[PDB]
Paper text:
Mutations of human CDC73 are associated with hyperparathyroidism-jaw tumor (HPT-JT) syndrome, which is an autosomal dominant disorder characterized by parathyroid tumors, fibro-osseous jaw tumors, cystic kidney lesions and uterine tumors. PAF1C participates in recruitment of histone modification factors and promotion of transcriptional elongation. To understand how the CDC73 N-terminal domain contributes to CDC73 functions and how CDC73 pathogenic mutations may lead to HPT-JT and other diseases, we have characterized the structural features of the CDC73 N-terminal regions and revealed a previously unidentified N-terminal globular domain. Here, we demonstrate that CDC73-NTD can form a well-folded globular domain, and is conserved from human to yeast.
Author numbering: 3 to 100
Write the structure that this text describes.
Amino acid sequence: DVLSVLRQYNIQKKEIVVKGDEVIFGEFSWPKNVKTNYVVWGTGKEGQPREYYTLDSILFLLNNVHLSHPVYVRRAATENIPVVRRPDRKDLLGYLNG
């Protein structure tokens, strides 16, 4: 699963290459909008479909982790990238950083 690959690359600081709409991990590649297996907070409940974070959304959080979460939310809105919702933030960053 691509989120486990992203964890591995992030923890060992191995280069991740973004090229147009593609993300390259070593000699492997995924579309940037590939769905991870991480269900978005609030979805999959009250009869509404599960939705999953895209790889792009997670990379954008990682690249902007220095911001306070509210300012990051504004940056995601401005860049038209889905936000990682606050209830998912600590767990996702914990998983990605080990």
